[PDB]
Amino acid sequence: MQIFVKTLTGKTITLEVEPSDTIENVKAKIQDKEGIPPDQQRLIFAGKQLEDGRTLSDYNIQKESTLHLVLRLRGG
Amino acid sequence: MQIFVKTLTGKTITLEVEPSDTIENVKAKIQDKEGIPPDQQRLIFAGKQLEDGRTLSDYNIQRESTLHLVLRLRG
């Protein structure tokens, strides 16, 4: 299935994913397109922050769902 | 000859058809009533998905037989 990710530029990309893919798997796909390391990635769906060990199906993310990418910087 | 077509929502459609009508013809009749393009329709009879070039009689679909209309996720 296809989902969309709104990236750090505001641009929107399309990812080919499987329903049981983990959020970690999605983050690995996103780095390929955007150049943002998975560790610096936070993913938001329907306002909620997604957890790396959980899957798309866990959050009922279906085709044409849009995820929002937010930068996670630590420290400072 | 009439047949029934049940949708996902439980809605029952009643179609006037002929025994030698193709499945393509049935999809066209469903398009007239429901507005759904034939390419998005899957028709099932007694659990089997019907092929568009074959006829109702090919499948032993008779007066008062019931088909199930399954829709192709648009996209």
What does this structure look like?
The complex is a heterodimer of chains A (76) and B (75). Chain A has 1 helix and 5 strands; from the N terminus they run E-E-H-E-E-E. In chain A, strand 1 and strand 2 form a beta hairpin. In chain A, strands 2-1-5-3-4 form a 5-stranded mixed beta sheet, covered by helices on one side. Chain A is an alpha+beta fold. In chain A, 16% of the residues lie in helices and 30% in strands. Chain A has one domain: Ubiquitin-like (UB roll), CATH 3.10.20. Chain B is of the alpha+beta class and 75 residues long. Chain B has a single domain (1-75), classed as Ubiquitin-like (UB roll). Helices cover 16% and strands 31% of the residues of chain B. Chain B has one helix spanning 23-34, and strands at residues 2-6, 12-16, 41-45, 48-49, 66-71. Chain B has a 5-stranded mixed beta sheet with strand order 2-1-5-3-4, with helices on one face. Chain B starts with a strand and ends with a strand. The chains hardly touch.
Task: Write a brief caption for the model.
By secondary structure, chain A is an alpha+beta fold. Chain A has 1 helix and 5 strands; from the N terminus they run ββαβββ. Chain B contains 1 helix and 5 strands; from the N terminus they run E-E-H-E-E-E.
| Total beta strand runs of chain A | 5
Strand content of chain B: 25-35%
Q: Spell out the CATH superfamily of chain B.
A: Phosphatidylinositol 3-kinase Catalytic Subunit, Chain A, domain 1
Gross CATH architecture of chain B? Roll
Q: What is the first-to-last residue Cα distance of chain B?
A: 35 Å
Regarding quaternary structure, how should these chains be classified? heterodimer
Biggest sheet strand order of chain B reads: 2-1-5-3-4
Helical content class of chain B:
10-25%
Number of helices of chain A: 1
Largest sheet descriptor of chain B:
5 strands, mixed
**What name is given to the CATH topology of chain A?**
Ubiquitin-like (UB roll)
CATH fold-level assignment of chain B: Ubiquitin-like (UB roll)
- Sequence of strands across the biggest β-sheet of chain A: 2-1-5-3-4
User: Helices and strands of chain A, in N-to-C order?
Assistant: EEHEEE
* H/I helix tally of chain B: 1
Estimated share of beta-strand residues of chain A: 25-35%
CATH superfamily of chain A: Phosphatidylinositol 3-kinase Catalytic Subunit, Chain A, domain 1
How many β-strands of chain B, per DSSP?
Answer: 5
Secondary structural class of chain B: alpha+beta
Level-1 CATH class name of chain A: Alpha Beta
